[PDB]
Chains A and B, each alone.
Chain A
Amino acid sequence: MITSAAGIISLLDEDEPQLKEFALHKLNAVVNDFWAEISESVDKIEVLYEDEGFRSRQFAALVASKVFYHLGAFEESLNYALGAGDLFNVNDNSEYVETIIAKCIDHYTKQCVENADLPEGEKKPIDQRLEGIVNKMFQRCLDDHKYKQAIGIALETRRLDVFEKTILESNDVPGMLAYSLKLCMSL
């Protein structure tokens, strides 16, 4: 709707967030139109996000996570997309969701490689919601397994029981173990 509206900055810099909630809800509509206009309110979004005063940390962490990767590196957006707590979001073909799950999987298996060579000692903490949102779309891929990515993504994650549930409901078991070892011997 709006393009150069600056009133949302003053509404975001204001107390009594009962007016901030619908202002952010309407901000999520024009954020794809103009992502750079929020760069002046990014600092205040971080201020209201770090403290526990605001009740919905996902309304701030989603805006920050959708403006950071539009502004700079995917790391700072990933820390708040993974730091948004409980997020109710269905599967969509949007660029935002596919990029945050793309970098989420890439950095997920990246941490799995950084922690795969160190089985014991100085183990880095991994949040459970990362396993929830990676294993959610992962299981969505494991509805039929498409007979191509089961052992592939099961091997990229370097996890212990990730592939035992894949071979449970699978056709041509000797083809899945022969293709499995064939993929394992070529990496």
Chain B
Amino acid sequence: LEEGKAGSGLRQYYLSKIEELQLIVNDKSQNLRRLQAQRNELNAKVRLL
């Protein structure tokens, strides 16, 4: 055996690094959507003007 713990184990660790890339895409979506909320709140503010 020694595949699910070693081969699929390093495949799962590579999946964890893929989860790190999805954490970079994740927090990029977070701060980009918060800045999007800032611009939306400012343009909505002059819309209230």
User: Contact string, A89-130, partner B, CB cutoff 8 A, digits 1/0?
Assistant: 001010000100110000000000000000000000000000
Smallest CB–CB gap between B18 and chain A, Å?
Answer: 13
Instruction: Tell me the interface secondary structure of chain A in the complex.
Output: helix
Q: Is the Cβ of A98 less than 8 Å from the Cβ of B10? A: yes
Q: Is the Cβ of A91 less than 8 Å from the Cβ of B2? A: yes
Query: Residue on B with the closest CB to A137?
Result: B3
Interface size class of B (residues with CB under 8 A): under 10
Query: Residue on B with the closest CB to A97?
Result: B7
Is B11's CB within 8 Å of the partner chain A? Answer: yes
- Residues in A whose Cβ lies below 8 Å from that of B8: 149
Q: Which of A54-62, A69-77, A139-147 contacts B (4 or more CB under 8 A)?
A: A139-147
Q: Is the Cβ of B1 less than 8 Å from the Cβ of A140? A: yes
- Residues in A whose Cβ lies below 8 Å from that of B1: 140-141, 143, 146
User: Contact string, B1-45, partner A, CB cutoff 8 A, digits 1/0?
Assistant: 111101110110000000000000000000000000000000000
